[PDB]
Amino acid sequence: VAQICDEALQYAARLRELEPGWSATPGCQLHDAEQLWLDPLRAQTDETFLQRRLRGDWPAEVGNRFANWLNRAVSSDSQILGSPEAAQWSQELSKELTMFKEILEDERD
């Protein structure tokens, strides 16, 4: 569970240097808020209106979308809610989402 958040942060870092300006791309369905959840470049292109949209608006929806994708990575059945092992999985999902959100809070901040 920690390896998924670690690999996701490593993938965001490895993508967040090659593209100079992380512009809004046609077809960025996960790039609606992932236009700042991805590489946010505060250049002349990504101006103060981009530096203020991603400045004040945080990537919690990227974090909440990532937490939903982590919940939907494995399936959902009577084992995730009818046992303490599913309770352990839910507590680990909440802990990993809180850890990734505490990481992303210092990203734009």
Partner: protein, 333 residues
Amino acid sequence: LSTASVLAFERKLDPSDALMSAGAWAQRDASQEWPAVTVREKSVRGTISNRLKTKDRDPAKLDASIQSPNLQTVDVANLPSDADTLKVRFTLRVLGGAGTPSACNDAAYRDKLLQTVATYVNDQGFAELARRYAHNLANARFLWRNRVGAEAVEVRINHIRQGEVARAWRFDALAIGLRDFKADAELDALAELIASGLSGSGHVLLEVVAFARIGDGQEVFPSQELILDKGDKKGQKSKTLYSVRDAAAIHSQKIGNALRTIDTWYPDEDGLGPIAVEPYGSVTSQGKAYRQPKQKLDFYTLLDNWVLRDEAPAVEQQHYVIANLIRGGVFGE
């Protein structure tokens, strides 16, 4: 015997999508040139007001949240400001042939089910179920929130043989109750028409028109779609409403759920009121299943006892089982 591992029934009483239009009361006679209610768009902006986790975060973060509110755009639908009266119109086919499956593995289970339902039919007609359906047409259940707080509601039901109105019914949908099912002459006529339709002994096509005064320009309530995220939040990632060729509309399953609020016969009470007819007969707004499967009252237990082993329940639970067969579904394993 065993149950069929693949049963399937088809929906009887299938309605259309209801379309909303708008006009002035005392023009209900000329209520056919009336312009449609058009799903518009507006921009809202509101604070954070939900039950935030108490002492999750510091109150300076609460003060900072109000500095940065969200702003979203929603679909609304209002009457035109000259008009005070909504008009909701749909059509209904009462098909009939109710106990016959449309997919069935077992050849003896089909015969036993059809003998069971034929025993029900010649034992007692569909007059109870059709009387309750004629209630849910005469009172405007299908005006879901559009009835709530409305001053006057009138339902007009027409029978349609050819391109021609055969018999017309008119009602006062507020004087006819929402909870009790009483006796009336015109509703017994409509009940025996719907009962002849369900029994397979005639053709029934109804035109159901409901006239609810609300006031000069108020909000009407179509049914609501869910949002695919090709277009951004600037562009309704908040609220889309349902429509047709530029007219505000209600889904057909919404109206059909308003029609099969039959079930007074569930072990809690009838003082709560009738509910919809579901297997494990549930309510979405209450968030619970009435008619639990550990009690012996859901559709599957009653059906398997009455078909496989001839344990005929009480008459009202037979009305429940036949009403689930009129609803239609994907039954079986």
